[PDB]
Amino acid sequence: TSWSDRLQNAADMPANMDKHALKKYRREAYHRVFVNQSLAMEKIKCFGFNMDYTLAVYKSPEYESLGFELTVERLVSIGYPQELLSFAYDSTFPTRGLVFDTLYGNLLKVDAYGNLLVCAHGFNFIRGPETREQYPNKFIQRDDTERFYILNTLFNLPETYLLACLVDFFTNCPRYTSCETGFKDGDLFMSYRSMFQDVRDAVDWVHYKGSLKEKTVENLEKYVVKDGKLPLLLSRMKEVGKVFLATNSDYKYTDKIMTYLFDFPHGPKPGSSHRPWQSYFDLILVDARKPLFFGEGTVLRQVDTKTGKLKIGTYTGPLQHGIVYSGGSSDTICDLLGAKGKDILYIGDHIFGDILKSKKRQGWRTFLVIPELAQELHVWTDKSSLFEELQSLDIFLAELISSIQRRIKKVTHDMDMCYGMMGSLFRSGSRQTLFASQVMRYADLYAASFINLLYYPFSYLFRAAHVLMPHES
Amino acid sequence: TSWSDRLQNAADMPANMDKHALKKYRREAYHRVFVNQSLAMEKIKCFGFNMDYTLAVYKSPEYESLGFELTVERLVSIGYPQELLSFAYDSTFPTRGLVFDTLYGNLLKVDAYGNLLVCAHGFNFIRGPETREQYPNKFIQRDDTERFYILNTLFNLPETYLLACLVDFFTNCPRYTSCETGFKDGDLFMSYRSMFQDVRDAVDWVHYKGSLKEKTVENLEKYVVKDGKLPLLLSRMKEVGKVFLATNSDYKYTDKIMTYLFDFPHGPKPGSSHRPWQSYFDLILVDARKPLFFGEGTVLRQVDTKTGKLKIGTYTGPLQHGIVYSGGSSDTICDLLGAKGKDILYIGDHIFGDILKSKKRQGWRTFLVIPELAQELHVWTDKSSLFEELQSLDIFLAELISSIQRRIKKVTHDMDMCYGMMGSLFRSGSRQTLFASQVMRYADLYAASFINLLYYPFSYLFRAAHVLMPHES
Amino acid sequence: TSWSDRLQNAADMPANMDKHALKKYRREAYHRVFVNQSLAMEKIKCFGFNMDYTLAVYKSPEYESLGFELTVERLVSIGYPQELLSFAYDSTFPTRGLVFDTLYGNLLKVDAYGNLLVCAHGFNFIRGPETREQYPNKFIQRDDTERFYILNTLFNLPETYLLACLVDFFTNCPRYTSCETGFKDGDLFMSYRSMFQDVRDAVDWVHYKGSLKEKTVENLEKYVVKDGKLPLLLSRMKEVGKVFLATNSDYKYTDKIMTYLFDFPHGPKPGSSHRPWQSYFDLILVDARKPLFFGEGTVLRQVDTKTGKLKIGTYTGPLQHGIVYSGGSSDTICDLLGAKGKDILYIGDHIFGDILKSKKRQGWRTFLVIPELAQELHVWTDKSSLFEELQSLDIFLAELISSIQRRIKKVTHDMDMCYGMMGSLFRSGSRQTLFASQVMRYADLYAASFINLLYYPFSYLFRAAHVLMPHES
Amino acid sequence: TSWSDRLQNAADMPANMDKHALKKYRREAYHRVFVNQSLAMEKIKCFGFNMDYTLAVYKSPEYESLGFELTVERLVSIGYPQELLSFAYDSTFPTRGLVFDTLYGNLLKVDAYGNLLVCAHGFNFIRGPETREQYPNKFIQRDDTERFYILNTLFNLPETYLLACLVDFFTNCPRYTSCETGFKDGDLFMSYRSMFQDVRDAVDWVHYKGSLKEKTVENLEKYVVKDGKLPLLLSRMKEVGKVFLATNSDYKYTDKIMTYLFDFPHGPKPGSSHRPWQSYFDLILVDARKPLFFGEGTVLRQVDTKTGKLKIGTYTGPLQHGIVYSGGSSDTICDLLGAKGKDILYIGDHIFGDILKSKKRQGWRTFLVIPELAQELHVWTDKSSLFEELQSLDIFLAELISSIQRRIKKVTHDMDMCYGMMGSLFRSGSRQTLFASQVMRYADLYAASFINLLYYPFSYLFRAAHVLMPHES
Ligand SMILES: Nc1ncnc2c1ncn2[C@@H]1O[C@H](COP(=O)(O)OP(=O)(O)OP(=O)(O)O)[C@@H](O)[C@H]1O
Ligand SMILES: Nc1ncnc2c1ncn2[C@@H]1O[C@H](COP(=O)(O)OP(=O)(O)OP(=O)(O)O)[C@@H](O)[C@H]1O
Ligand SMILES: Nc1ncnc2c1ncn2[C@@H]1O[C@H](COP(=O)(O)OP(=O)(O)OP(=O)(O)O)[C@@H](O)[C@H]1O
Ligand SMILES: Nc1ncnc2c1ncn2[C@@H]1O[C@H](COP(=O)(O)OP(=O)(O)OP(=O)(O)O)[C@@H](O)[C@H]1O
């Protein structure tokens, strides 16, 4: 039972729009919209979306496996050993948001202050005292961006597992001598950095030059979550404001995916005429290149919607029905729709490129879609006993014979393993992750699916608990 | 009654070291050490200090006025109008941590997300709807560092008031035509940016080339808080670990100030032999150049303690008794004292250069000294009624005829004016400031004076409330 | 009669190696090696080559036309108008070494001090007084590299003509409104900069992703000059030193071209066994990435000569027979062959990336191959009368009724048109070009073909006239 | 007999303005204007000057000794050993234009291609074979600007000698251990780089904060060459165009020096009323900050000529009589005087900041003043026998028993020593220096004094020999 299965079970259900059924529905956590900063919806005038893993949630683990197979094939085709072809993606290992250390070849799970919480070299999890040789302060300098790559998105889920497989394969293959910073193959040296780069380059190649998009479109029911409540919610959004799409995908792919997402024998509700997906949007912008999009951006261009290619030159005209933009910046959207930042609720999945940057660079309101949260919420309500036992041991230990500290590390471990081999997305025991930090800080609203917005009336006031400093209480 | 008066009233009292008197004393808030992240003191092996506004708290407003007089004189001496000589520092206007906007010449008080909370052009406070011409989203891009300067330190207190005086003087002096971005003087244009720079340059000149240090030393009782509990606390720190000084001042000035700070007819306790201040330190490092200090730093040099000048060349020797260092980096301290980051409790006043950078760059534990907090704590406990009335109106308004929203803005204003014309350091009404945000995030411990550490036993476990995400509860 | 026809007439002749026949042969200018700085060949220990337009001179204009056809097709395939397909490369317009001004869309021919010598907008040559609107000082800032691109190589010959065709087509096509900095197509704007970029990008794409290499290999006799004196000269070079190849091409293409260049029924001389081309080289390095090659370079890699792909990782081994390198730096060559800079004679065609950078960055001796010089030499000896008449008018005008200055500009024009519509490579009348300047400065030796080195004994002392300052004479 | 003595002998003579006396006078080389690029004076509309070592030639060696004494004193005052006070400037060692290598502490004399011509470590001149340990190719990468500083100006004459003295003192003082890259003083290390910096910083301090300007003004007849032909030439320049001053000095110092330069009991000719120096100028600009001046420059300011301080703000007004500018750019001059680049003859002494940059960045015509050339010209005409003997041996050696090559190196050495211990400014034997290269390339006209322009009629056509490539002849 994967997180994408819960989303597709809830998607197969028709919208009960009775005012009482909505209140009762959003009482359950799997359908709630969770609040980090107060937000009054009657001040929202423009609703903004990205596509990949927001409108178009790719089914798990089929989509991560397809990415893993295709990336592995690319690496073999440029000269990596045939033993990669015998790997096989294991959705139980990787958790989203890990840091790969290109110096020593480890996956690290860190809190916001760069403290180590989990460290795995290949498939070998390194315990507290043994990490101190490489991490003398149990700490990483997050600013050292040449050394530490954060794997933020669900596209990074294959490479997260792939990076372990590779370290594990070379570590234990006798053709290679393991060194501190990589692998000697006789007279060739492959550093963990250059290996990381080869993986990284390959994933890029698979998305942009390879067969990933091709193979997704040819079996969309295997790969993309489809929900007939999506036309309904967007149509209700356009009744009270403007709806725009700002995606990093190209128009050809966006068209195929959106068409599928809207292919029903009806419009917003059952029994209405089916409309084309573009008619649900006041502004459709592709090739967004976020997060540069929220700074100076790129030259603004016009898509030839018949051929799918860009017209030649910079677009200088007005917003007209059925025009489609490529590139540009976030200001392009604000000028054309005549909106200020806090007018906009931008709905996205990239904690950094979608959410943080729009918040910090433009003052946009942010809604972060967290697909894994549909499963994680279940695990959390079925093991509330282990976390509650953890909160109790933390409290008793404070009142204090350190045989307690070893029962804490054990309960920690068992709680963590329920989510995966790399723990929960948001914490390792009582200690929160960098991801969790960035959600709380930069995401006003968050949820397992944005479709949860449908169960809230369009005047609602999302409330957040006021923050008080220590001395202020 | 200034914040520096409370600190000097509490400094004139001898240390009652009875185990019960200490518990009872730190029950009052003016003597508490406030906790943002749990910290176990038995893991602290090195105690680190900066000098200015930590060990050497300059008395207010005498020190801010001396800085204001000296800066004003410098500006007149390089060609500014004689009317500056008739200004006079007003400690009731400036609050620490404001942002000066060099484009439009305003002082802004902002939250962590760059939202405007107060905007004053000169001495004219601009209300909500009128700021929207210049701040269409009520927002500033904090990343635009050419436009927005944060006034972080209490040395910035004179310039904070001086910048208003100048905008107010030119705005209302008929020799000058006020423009959007500065002042026309016939055929000369002075932009708010170049004016800001002239002020900025002048303050620097006063500290490094002018008479500020000279005039401080010649009347230390007028200017520096002195406390006989300081020798005691440092001597107790050296009983359980190592004590180092990392200050940005030069050795000559550090020597004069520290000598004064330790001039008593006794040592740590009454009746003991007086020791020189240097003997309270395992490592004394001047000319620190923070925050670059926490990165690559500067070349490490040796001070000639007799002449006060640097020896020629880079120091390459070991730590010996009575050696004094200039420059270097934070690694210089860790190697020589043989300490890891989380071993160190660095005590400082610069939220950015002392606290943030050591936390984020090196994993150091941080203690932030907030001198204003001695007065602010009083104002807060004597007007708890207005804040509690504010929390109530915020709650009732949520249950909701918007005549409530105007009683909120009025109570906000009256609460704020109790702290100054620019509000409290930590909030404007229910909304917290960027400073408050950075304290909670990067300062493990904070207090009005570090001497509050003396009232805690050296095994204490400072505890912080665990943070839970919305869905986690 | 193109420059590549003279080279192939002289290539079809067998080497007369009689000591007297060589002296007499190199008396004619078409076979001379021309000297800019004295060079003693007995001090040369390593001979270095690049491939494209040095070892492998592509026949003209067939190769420039193939590049022009392929580039034009690419531009139409990404959305440029169908009228490009009716263009047709005209080898009489472009001269090598022009500057394209991306601001105003002109091809300029400039001297070393950035003085305009010819300015053509499209196919319209702009006269002296009319250029002063756009070029008020008849001058360009060569340091402004965003504005001015120098077309240095014979690969730039198609784009040189293509850039005119495009300006001429849009200028005179009524669908487009000509502006100062580009072309309005209703609501799209194509600046001369973005147009230049589109051309530039296309040429790159044709070489690296398109069909240019493919179509060259399938008809090498149409495209590549072949000479049986090349095996002989290289074999004589290896008798007195070391020979290395440092080319920017990949191994697959290098192999196909070199194989052809050496496909004869014999070795160095007629009647000897044929050897493979690799055996003429002590070190074979591909993927050179010059001119970065002469700085820090790139990671050094090893080619799998069977598959043609790079092995995985950085090469760390020694120079062994039959190893082939990819990337690296110029130091890689010096260490492995144990040579100092002035030991090396590097033979190349890129005045900047081959010649200047090796001279200025590493002290290498330089030999520049100038293919056009085979035809240019002819034009020069058949019109020596017009240049001599120009030198006379320049002298008489100095003795001086400015009806002389108009006979000078007329003789200038007629002399120039003999070389092309864009004049000679080295001068426009009495005034030398930037190219000519850079040859004299950075090329020790130069010639129409490096094969001219065969007619000099391997002890020869190339002599250059000593330079005297004005006051020194 | 120093170069400044010849200039002051020729300055003490009144101008014979008879048309025949001028022709005959400029037949001698000490009064000629030497030509590198043809220049027609009737096209010159604006004459531009810098002050230091152009208008105000500081007498030698008194001014270099005053700089050497003052710099040495500064270094002792910041902690350098007392033995410096016993140094004493020796005008026979340093030649202008040397390169100091901050890695190995050597003064190098190099040609344009970075070839070593002389290498002295301290006062020890290193011969050919011994430099190959540190300079394996007898070559330096001129682009490595962190390692190699060019000493371009006559202000660099003291530091040139001072750098040798220091290397020589530490090398042979037994308190210090000489290392490859500097000097160990027990536990302090002084690298040649940091030593170079200390010298460099000190020279700056002496000019800007020290007593050099003060002590020059108090004895101008000891320090500044004065000539009554200077008012005459400038007055003749203003009869046929515009005259502007663009100097890097401040207004106070410029005023004192210019006043002296013009203090005579008469105006341009004897018997005319004396005018103030400012009246000889259409535009007077101080604080020029060249060579940035020829790029984006600095903010343009206005000098208060009464107080000598800058007014506050950016100047925005027109050119009016008696206004004086500070900062700005070269465009400021062209706009205000309404001149194109090739209208301007800029007269200066900085081969790089005055001459090269104006030529390459703005197309300005350049006149380089070379004070040493007054003596050097004498040495050259009195030893023409040794150079002519050198040209003969170079020719005979080409016809060739290498006992010739050792007579060449000996004649080279004896010719060189006539100019100084560091050879002539322009060559070492038959090989020209980088300086000589940059003069020929970027200086249209050059001379020992610009006053030599007075002996040429204001219509003159300076002619230069046309350059022909090898194959073109
Ligand atoms: N999730 C992320 N993915 C990629 N880059 C990131 C992410 N979060 C932060 N960064 C970038 O990494 C760099 C280093 O992070 P650093 O901790 O120095 O700043 P920061 O993230 O703003 O700090 P904090 O979040 O603790 O306030 C910054 O340039 C930041 O923009
Ligand atoms: N108090 C301060 N004083 C000076 N500079 C600061 C201060 N706080 C942050 N900065 C710097 O200002 C720049 C812009 O701030 P930005 O908001 O982009 O990052 P940030 O402060 O890390 O963000 P946040 O604190 O919201 O996570 C950054 O380079 C940051 O280091
Ligand atoms: N043929 C060329 N192709 C491309 N770039 C060049 C060429 N020649 C010079 N450049 C580069 O163009 C830039 C600007 O040229 P600039 O005239 O400022 O320097 P330069 O060429 O060394 O000058 P000069 O050759 O007149 O001494 C420099 O970075 C230089 O390296
Ligand atoms: N006399 C000088 N003083 C200081 N810097 C110089 C001088 N001459 C050149 N430079 C600078 O030194 C740097 C390195 O010189 P480099 O030889 O790479 O270029 P260049 O001087 O233009 O070359 P060339 O003069 O041989 O054409 C360049 O940035 C150049 O501007």
Per-residue H/E/C for D218-245: CCHHHHECCCCHHHHHHHHHHHHCEEEE
The pair of structure tokens assigned to B426 is: 């930590």
CB atoms within 10 A of CB D420: 20
Alpha carbon distance A375, A373 (integer Å): 5
Q: Which amino acid is at D86?
A: S
Spell out which residues line ligand 2, taking CB within 6 angstroms. Answer: A 360; B 112, 142-143, 145, 150, 152, 351-352
Alpha carbon distance D124, D106 (integer Å): 10
Burial of B15 (0-12, 13-18, 19+ CB in 10 A): buried
Burial of A28 (0-12, 13-18, 19+ CB in 10 A): exposed
The pair of structure tokens assigned to A58 is: 């790719």
Q: What residues does B47 pair with on adjacent strands?
A: B243, B345
Q: Across D318-457, where does the E strand assignment appear? A: 324-327, 344-348, 365-369, 427-428, 431-432, 445-447
Burial of A184 (0-12, 13-18, 19+ CB in 10 A): middle
Under DSSP, the state recorded for D127 is P
| A44 and A244 Cβ atoms separated by less than 8 Å | no
Alpha carbon distance A112, A440 (integer Å): 11
List residues of chain C with CB under 8 Å from any CB of chain D. 29, 32, 34-36, 113-115, 136-139, 141-143, 340-342, 359-363, 373, 377, 380, 391, 394, 398, 426-427, 430, 432, 436, 439-440, 461, 463, 466-467, 469-472
Q: From residue D260, how far is each of C392, D254, D268 by CA, in Å?
A: 50, 10, 15
Nearest Cα residue in chain C from D445: C470
Which pairing describes strands A106-110 and A116-121: parallel, antiparallel, or unpaired?
A: antiparallel
Alpha carbon distance D25, D46 (integer Å): 26
Nearest Cα residue in chain D from C383: D472
User: Helix or strand or coil: residue D319?
Assistant: coil
The pair of structure tokens assigned to C430 is: 């009495």
Which parts of B47-144 fold into alpha helices (H)?
Answer: 62-77, 128-131
Q: Which amino acid is at B136?
A: P
| B255 and B330 Cβ atoms separated by less than 8 Å | no
| B213 and B250 Cβ atoms separated by less than 8 Å | no
Sequence length of chain C is: 473
In sequence order, the 6+-apart residues with CB closer than 8 A to the CB of A112 are A432, A433, A434, A437, A438
The pair of structure tokens assigned to C213 is: 């290499």
| A285 and A51 Cβ atoms separated by less than 8 Å | no
Distance from CA of C357 to the nearest CA of A (A): 29
Nearest to B234 by CA among B427, B15, B389: B15
Helix axis angle for C156-171 and C62-77, nearest 10°, is 50
Q: Enumerate the residues of chain D whose CB falls inside 8 A of the CB of residue C394.
A: 466
Q: Which of C96, C142, C160 to mutate to test the pocket of ligand 3 (most atoms within 8 A of CB)?
A: C142
CA dihedral C137, C140, C143, C146 (to 10 degrees): 130
Q: Across A34-147, where does the E strand assignment appear? A: 34-35, 39-40, 46-49, 99-101, 106-110, 116-121, 124-125
* CA A468, A469, B1, B2 torsion-angle sign: negative
* Cα B134 to chain centroid, rounded: 30
* CA B159, B160, B161, B167 torsion-angle sign: positive
* Cα B16 to chain centroid, rounded: 29
What is the whole-number distance in angstroms between the Cα of residue C330 and the centre of ligand 4? Answer: 22
Which parts of D78-211 fold into alpha helices (H)?
Answer: 128-131, 156-171, 192-208
State phi, psi for B65 to the nearest 5 degrees.
-70, -40
Sequence length of chain A is: 473
Q: Which residue has the tokens 């708010």?
A: B192
User: Helix or strand or coil: residue D63?
Assistant: helix
Nearest to A226 by CA among A56, A88, A347: A56
Ligand 3, atom 16: closest residue by C-alpha: C143
In chain B, how long is the greatest CA-to-CA distance? 75
Alpha carbon distance B68, B58 (integer Å): 14
User: Helix or strand or coil: residue D314?
Assistant: strand
Under DSSP, the state recorded for A216 is H
Nearest to C247 by CA among C362, C97, C341, C348: C348
Q: Enumerate the residues of chain C whose CB falls inside 8 A of the CB of residue A312.
A: 78-80, 185, 188, 190, 198
Q: Which amino acid is at C121?
A: H
Nearest to D450 by CA among D29, D45, D60, D32: D32
| D193 and D152 Cβ atoms separated by less than 8 Å | no
CA dihedral C398, C404, C410, C413 (to 10 degrees): 10
| B246 and B50 Cβ atoms separated by less than 8 Å | yes
The C-alpha angle with vertex B156 and arms to B152 and B162, in degrees rounded to 5, equals 135
Which pairing describes strands C324-327 and C283-286: parallel, antiparallel, or unpaired?
A: parallel
State phi, psi for B190 to the nearest 5 degrees.
-110, 105
What is the whole-number distance in angstroms between the Cα of residue B294 and the centre of ligand 3? Answer: 40
Q: What residues does A324 pair with on adjacent strands?
A: A284
Q: From residue C305, how far is each of C252, C322, C325, D114 by CA, in Å?
A: 9, 9, 10, 39
Helix axis angle for C373-382 and C3-11, nearest 10°, is 100
| C8 and C230 Cβ atoms separated by less than 8 Å | no
Nearest to A45 by CA among A242, A233, A238, A235: A242
In sequence order, the 6+-apart residues with CB closer than 8 A to the CB of A219 are none
Alpha carbon distance D228, D270 (integer Å): 9
The pair of structure tokens assigned to A212 is: 């990933």
User: Helix or strand or coil: residue C219?
Assistant: coil
Method of determination used here:
X-ray
- Helix (H), strand (E) at residue B156: helix B156-171
The C-alpha angle with vertex B299 and arms to B294 and B302, in degrees rounded to 5, equals 110
Q: What residues does C99 pair with on adjacent strands?
A: C108, C150
Alpha carbon distance D210, D215 (integer Å): 10
Distance from CA of C363 to the nearest CA of D (A): 7
Q: Which amino acid is at D7?
A: L
Q: From residue A324, how far is each of A207, A308, D127 by CA, in Å?
A: 22, 10, 73
Domains of chain B plus CATH, in order, are: 41-57+225-368 (3.40.50.1000), 62-217 (no CATH)
Sheet arrangement for strand B182-185: B177-178, B182-185, B188-191, D314-315
Judged by 3 or more CB pairs under 8 A, whether A touches B is yes
The set of chains that have 3 or more CB pairs under 8 A with A is: B, C
Q: Which amino acid is at C444?
A: D
Burial of D423 (0-12, 13-18, 19+ CB in 10 A): buried
Alpha carbon distance A30, A28 (integer Å): 6
Atom of ligand 3 nearest to the CA of C143: 14
Q: What residues does C427 pair with on adjacent strands?
A: C432
* D397-417 burial code (b ≥16 CB/10 A, e <16): eeeeeeeeeeebeebbeebbe
| D96 and D154 Cβ atoms separated by less than 8 Å | yes
What is the whole-number distance in angstroms between the Cα of residue B142 and the centre of ligand 2? Answer: 7
Ligand 2, atom 16: closest residue by C-alpha: B143
